[PDB]
Amino acid sequence: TYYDLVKAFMAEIRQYIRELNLIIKVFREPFVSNSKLFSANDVENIFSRIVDIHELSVKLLGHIEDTVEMTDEGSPHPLVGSCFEDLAEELAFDPYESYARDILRPGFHDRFLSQLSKPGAALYLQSIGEGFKEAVQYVLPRLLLAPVYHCLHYFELLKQLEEKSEDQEDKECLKQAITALLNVQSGMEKICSKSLAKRRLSESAIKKMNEIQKNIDGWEGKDIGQCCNEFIMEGTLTRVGAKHERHIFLFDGLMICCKSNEYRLKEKFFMRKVQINDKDDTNEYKHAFEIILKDENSVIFSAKSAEEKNNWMAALISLQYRSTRLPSADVYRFAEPDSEENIIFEEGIPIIKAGTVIKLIERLTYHMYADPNFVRTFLTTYRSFCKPQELLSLIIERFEIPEPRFRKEYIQPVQLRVLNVCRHWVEHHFYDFERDAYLLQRMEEFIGTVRGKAMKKWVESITKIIQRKKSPPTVEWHISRPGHIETFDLLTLHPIEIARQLTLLESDLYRAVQPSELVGSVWTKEDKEINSPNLLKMIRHTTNLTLWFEKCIVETENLEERVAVVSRIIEILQVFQELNNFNGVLEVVSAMNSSPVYRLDHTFEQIPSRQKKILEEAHELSEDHYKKYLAKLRSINPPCVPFFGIYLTNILKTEEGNPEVLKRHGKELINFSKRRKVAEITGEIQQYQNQPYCLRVESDIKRFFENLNPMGNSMEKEFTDYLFNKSLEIEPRNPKPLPRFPKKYSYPLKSPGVRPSN
């Protein structure tokens, strides 16, 4: 897919960038350092545009990285067409043609060697360190081809992306990049097709391991796979002293010397020892080198040509040496450095515990890294410590960065994060803008203030989201037919539909609670009916249902029917679990663990095993202080109805368990951290209020559960006592025999099941 190619490309350019670094910092720096031995041109004649190419590459990868991270679920794949088009339009790839021209010129290597053999050069290279002179002479010329391979692949990469793009605007950018690169491509094409160049490029261009050992007779020691990880070379060489030219397989861990008959093992050498170069000798051996093994006798090989010898030394020498800001004045910024008076972290990204709105927003738009999780949490819970209008102002103040240069690794990324926050805000929290027309205006004015010629094209995606913001399963039925309200009851309705409608009811109830009903533990004070009317309406429904389940069970005097009643309820619990309705889960669990229902041993006795496990699995969610429930909530994907109680206890305790004021030097400072902690819980609550249920509403069934009133006109205690005395009546204590009661229901008690029709 387009995305696979991009992932593959990112890994490739990262390895490549590392190779460019090696070339620049390790091989080139020593020539640059010895001004007396090498002039600017000498360096130029060997390394060409290597530095520009490195800069272009880091720039390319950087843009592609931001693009990917800023790619929301709204796109079929990150759109990198523009990353390439912006660069191609500025003729940024021209350095590659010049580079290829310098490196693939016919006389390159000869001139390269003369530079290594002129007075004092060889000695200077040796003084750099062990292996440098050998690496420079036999390995560097190969590495110097990397930019050519890399750029040639670009031409093919762009074509494939163009063909696979799932976005018309992205496709267009790619077509344009391809076009803008035609000159560079035909230019490099002419350079690379010439015979010598073509040979050079071809030169440096575990099923195999087992396939190779299987074709070698008289094997010794362990398998190739038991000491090698890759296959490097396969050629022919002559061992000075041996009778027949040996065929050789070179692995990172083994140089295997065979005799062709297909082959017979002759020498099995372990790669972990020195390799020395040898000058030609009248001894008929030319293009030779010496291999030195541990406590073993040296062996000398000879290749067919100097080109062959070069390929072997390149690989062999590489194997031997394989191991080898200033922001503004603070009086114009967020420049204040981190301290204990700024941010505190929780004891790869650092988790924040507390901090100033300034430092908080700084980390929300941090230059070092992107924090998509911190951005998701902040935009869900910030309204408790910052007002929407103040947030936009702080964001704008964060964007408009004043210069004191290196501000491409600070100004470019910070402005990026700021805009990704704006996108997330408008995308997942548009209610802030529907509620304040001026807030939207300031946002549209700010978006239209973006300067970057390239940034505008990227920011158009944000504008599109703004303009935008301006089939569910069949209703299941059982014994009761649609419209027959009178007949509605726990066993008459379909168990699946009961759980479905209770979930819709319970979801709406949950989504209606405002943070102004929670903040300040307001639902616990004397004016709770006034300040938290939605919260109480939700809790009262939960209570109402827990009680209705108990009443249904306990008032079903006949044991057979009661077992049937307890069974549907467990079934309803199962669908609640499927629908991720935790309020509804704890609703049933609570009824099951109530005093009147808990002790009905005769009832639970006849309840199937699978159902007992579903219930037990449910009860375990509460254990250890909801440890499992808290875990499961995190692990699921909405919609869902969380259990509200835990949030209530956490807000109340956070407010009552932490001071309202911190004292310092006799002065009274307001503990804001405490208020921030409340806002995070509030924020979490609001996040779960977004996603709606893909379920069809059944108005009549909904009205049935909305009008349930188990308690009637009785007070709590009078009713609770009635349930318990009913439990004792239907299942008296031990020594008292279990009486029989007449049937209550005149319809079949067989459940239609929990699996939907089709």
Q: Which two tokens stand for residue 633?
A: 């909530």
Q: Which two tokens stand for residue 96?
A: 């590659």
* DSSP H/E element including 372: helix 372-381
Contact 715, 446 (CB under 8 A): no
Judged by DSSP in three states, 354 sits in strand
Instruction: Using the structure block, give the residue that is written with the tokens 């230019």.
Output: 187
Q: Which residues pair with 277 in a beta bridge?
A: 289
Amino acid 608 reads P
Q: Determine the Cα–Cα distance for residues 616 and 80; give it in Å rounded to an integer.
A: 51
Amino acid 251 reads F
Amino acid 193 reads S
Beta strands 299-302 and 231-239: pairing type? antiparallel
Query: What are the strands, taking DSSP E only, across 582-678?
Result: 661-664, 667-670
Give, in order, the Cα–Cα distances in Å from 291 to each of 19, 80, 231, 286, 527: 27, 48, 19, 15, 91
Q: Determine the Cα–Cα distance for residues 116 and 603; give it in Å rounded to an integer.
A: 94
Q: Which two tokens stand for residue 173?
A: 């950018």
Instruction: Using the structure block, give the residue that is written with the tokens 């793009």.
Output: 165
Q: Determine the Cα–Cα distance for residues 163 and 174; give it in Å rounded to an integer.
A: 9
Q: Determine the Cα–Cα distance for residues 501 and 696; give it in Å rounded to an integer.
A: 8
Q: Determine the Cα–Cα distance for residues 320 and 638; give it in Å rounded to an integer.
A: 55
Deposited experimental method: X-ray
Q: Determine the Cα–Cα distance for residues 287 and 373; give it in Å rounded to an integer.
A: 60
Among candidates 323, 386, 321, which has minimal Cα distance to 359?
386
Report DSSP letters for 26-48, one per residue.
IIIHHHHH-TTT--HHHHHHHHT
Among candidates 320, 305, 310, which has minimal Cα distance to 269?
320
Contact 701, 495 (CB under 8 A): no
Q: What is the CA radius of gyration of the chain?
A: 38
The vertex-247 CA angle with 246 and 252, nearest 5°, equals 115
Q: Determine the Cα–Cα distance for residues 38 and 739; give it in Å rounded to an integer.
A: 109
Give Dmax over CA atoms of the chain in angstroms: 118
Contact 414, 333 (CB under 8 A): no
The 3-state secondary structure of 152-203 reads HHHHHHHHHHHHHCCCHHHHHHHHHHHHHCHHHHHHHHHHHHCHHHHHHHHH
Which residues, in sequence order, are CB contacts of 757 under 8 Å at separation 6+? 474, 476
Q: What are residue 592's phi and psi, to 5 degrees?
A: -60, -40
Judged by DSSP in three states, 748 sits in coil
Q: Determine the Cα–Cα distance for residues 558 and 547; give it in Å rounded to an integer.
A: 19
Q: Which two tokens stand for residue 314?
A: 């390149």
Domains contained in the chain, CATH given: 2-203 (1.20.900.10), 207-320 (2.30.29.30), 343-468 (1.20.870.10), 485-730 (1.10.840.10)
Q: Determine the Cα–Cα distance for residues 80 and 66; give it in Å rounded to an integer.
A: 10
Among candidates 524, 484, 505, which has minimal Cα distance to 652?
524
Q: Which two tokens stand for residue 181?
A: 């690169």
**Whether the bond into 639 is cis, omega within 30 of 0:** yes
Q: Which two tokens stand for residue 630?
A: 């808290």
This PDB structure is determined at a resolution in Å of: 4.1
Q: Determine the Cα–Cα distance for residues 245 and 260; give it in Å rounded to an integer.
A: 9
Beta strands 216-217 and 263-270: pairing type? parallel
The vertex-263 CA angle with 257 and 268, nearest 5°, equals 25
- Taking residue 226's Cβ as centre, other Cβ atoms within 10 Å add up to 9
Among candidates 489, 500, 566, 554, which has minimal Cα distance to 727?
554
Q: Which two tokens stand for residue 156?
A: 């093919």
Contact 337, 310 (CB under 8 A): no
Q: Which two tokens stand for residue 696?
A: 């069809």
Q: Determine the Cα–Cα distance for residues 158 and 83; give it in Å rounded to an integer.
A: 11
Amino acid 333 reads R
Q: CA neighbours within 13 Å on the CB side: how many for 186?
A: 5
Judged by DSSP in three states, 441 sits in helix
Query: What are the strands, taking DSSP E only, across 571-703?
Result: 661-664, 667-670
